[PDB]
Design an enzyme around this catalytic site. Structure first.
Site, PDB file in Angstrom:
ATOM      1  N   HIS A 199    -104.419 -31.952  48.537  1.00 28.53           N
ATOM      2  CA  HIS A 199    -104.324 -32.982  49.566  1.00 28.53           C
ATOM      3  C   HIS A 199    -105.274 -34.160  49.302  1.00 28.53           C
ATOM      4  CE1 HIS A 199    -103.828 -34.418  53.888  1.00 28.53           C
ATOM      5  NE2 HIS A 199    -105.063 -34.884  53.610  1.00 28.53           N
ATOM      6  N   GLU A 200    -106.538 -33.850  49.034  1.00 23.79           N
ATOM      7  CA  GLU A 200    -107.525 -34.888  48.718  1.00 23.79           C
ATOM      8  C   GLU A 200    -107.257 -35.624  47.390  1.00 23.79           C
ATOM      9  OE1 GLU A 200    -109.547 -35.922  51.089  1.00 23.79           O
ATOM     10  OE2 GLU A 200    -109.044 -34.255  52.420  1.00 23.79           O
ATOM     11  N   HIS A 230    -104.589 -38.330  48.098  1.00 25.33           N
ATOM     12  CA  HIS A 230    -105.333 -39.493  48.590  1.00 25.33           C
ATOM     13  C   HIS A 230    -106.008 -40.252  47.462  1.00 25.33           C
ATOM     14  CE1 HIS A 230    -104.587 -39.112  52.793  1.00 25.33           C
ATOM     15  NE2 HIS A 230    -105.456 -38.126  53.089  1.00 25.33           N
ATOM     16  N   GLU A 260    -102.337 -40.507  56.062  1.00 21.07           N
ATOM     17  CA  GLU A 260    -102.382 -39.051  56.231  1.00 21.07           C
ATOM     18  C   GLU A 260    -100.993 -38.417  56.330  1.00 21.07           C
ATOM     19  OE1 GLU A 260    -104.623 -37.085  55.523  1.00 21.07           O
ATOM     20  OE2 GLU A 260    -106.434 -37.093  56.721  1.00 21.07           O
TER      21      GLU A 260
HETATM   22 ZN   LIG Z   1    -106.112 -36.500  54.320  1.00 23.97          ZN
END
Ligand SMILES: [Zn+2]
EC number: 3.4.24.69
Length: 396
Positions: free
Chosen positions: A209-210, A213, A238
């Site tokens: 997830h990171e 980003h 997000e």
């Molecule tokens: Zn996030």
């Protein structure tokens, strides 16, 4: 073998992949860092450096929902740091073992922040906050470009995020340029979610997830944290990153607008490179850096050396970064269980240890094959595999 070495915290420095380093921005003490892959470093330290208006003790009132956890002692001994280092390392291999993760990690390595740091439009210059100062065994220091830093969390141990340094008026994470990304993250903690059952989020899913980003930010195609949708208040960025049901709360009209916007940002870069006549520094030639940015933005070059943005190549790369790299699709690839919507209400924090192969492996996570944990996501079941999930007090 994304990490080509089994690193130990206590290992002697060499100035290449194990070194004491300084982070841009105050007179700080050097910290031990590990280059686990080209462009990617891990700093097994609590992040108290880059953000001075943040102390590691609980605040008067912890408000992070559904969960928050405080322990000022976490990550302060060599042994913890070693375990931290081996955990993060194992998570990169786990991510990399998937086709999706191979692709994302390759993009991240290619995603060198643009050299847009000069006052002169025709001059290429590295932005200094997209570098670190690496101490050599000879004692001297060398400035080194990097794309990604995995750092330990701040005060709130389970608040994981992607942060980067700004530069003047330029919006590096949103103008196509990119900037070096710092991910606050711990492989030693996870959080719960409920399903039909008390389950634990796989830390590979959380790291992925990171990294998504990070991918947005390295390519300067992140969406302003101010663009948000009311969910029955969550950022576009997000929702896009989580994917699934939530990623369609975003109208294709806005989706289309962004594509064109960032297409023109890539175009502006291409033209900058075409109009470049000089370069700052001794390390790289202007043609070398041209070639580097050609590779990152997948630009087409004619017989004259002139650059242009190919629509097919842009559309495919853009779609990859924004629609294919999603938490949702990582979940599909890992074949793990994960919460179905971005908003989580399960109030559980757990201490985990993914380093021993009896607990967690690269291929199966907690749901080990040829064990009882391989049935019905039992390895993530905090009641069934209770020895693997130490329930901690929630500070919220
Ligand atoms: Zn996030």
């Amino acid at each position: 073998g994304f990490v080509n070495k089994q690193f130990n915290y206590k290992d002697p420095v060499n100035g290449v992949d194990i070194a004491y380093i300084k982070i841009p921005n105050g007179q700080m003490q050097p910290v031990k860092a590990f280059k686990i892959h080209n462009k990617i470093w891990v700093i097994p330290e609590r992040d108290t450096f880059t953000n001075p208006e943040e102390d590691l003790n609980p605040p008067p009132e912890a408000k992070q929902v559904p969960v928050s956890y405080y322990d000022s002692t976490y990550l302060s001994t060599d042994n913890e740091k070693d375990n931290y280092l081996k955990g993060v390392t194992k998570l990169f291999e786990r991510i990399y073992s998937t086709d999706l993760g191979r692709m994302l990690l390759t993009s991240i390595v290619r995603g060198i922040p643009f050299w847009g740091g000069s006052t002169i439009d025709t001059e290429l210059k590295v932005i200094d906050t997209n570098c670190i100062n690496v101490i050599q065994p000879d004692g001297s220091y060398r400035s080194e470009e990097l794309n990604l830093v995995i750092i330990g969390p701040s005060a709130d141990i389970i608040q994981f995020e992607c942060k980067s340094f700004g530069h003047e008026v330029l919006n590096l994470t949103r103008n196509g340029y990119g900037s070096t990304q710092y991910i606050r993250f711990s492989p030693d903690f996870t959080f719960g979610f409920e399903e039909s059952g008390k389950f634990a989020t796989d830390p590979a899913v959380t790291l992925a997830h990171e990294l998504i980003h990070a991918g947005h930010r390295l390519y300067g195609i992140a969406i302003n944290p101010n663009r948000v949708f009311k969910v029955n208040e969550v950022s576009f960025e997000e929702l896009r990153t989580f994917g699934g049901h939530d990623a369609k709360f975003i109208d294709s009209l806005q989706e289309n607008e962004f594509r064109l916007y960032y297409y023109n940002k890539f175009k502006d870069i291409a033209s900058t490179l075409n109009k470049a006549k000089s370069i700052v520094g001794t390390t790289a030639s202007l043609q070398y850096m041209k070639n580097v940015f050609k590779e990152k933005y997948l630009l087409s070059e004619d017989t004259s050396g002139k650059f242009s943005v190919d629509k097919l190549k842009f559309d495919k790369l853009y779609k990859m970064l924004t629609e294919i790299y999603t938490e949702d699709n990582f979940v599909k690839f890992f074949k793990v269980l994960n919460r179905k919507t971005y908003l989580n209400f399960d109030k559980a924090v757990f201490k985990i240890n993914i380093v021993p192969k009896v607990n967690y492996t690269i291929y199966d996570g907690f749901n080990l094959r040829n064990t009882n944990l391989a049935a019905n996501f039992n390895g993530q079941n905090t009641e069934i595999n209770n020895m693997n999930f130490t329930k901690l007090k929630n500070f919220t």
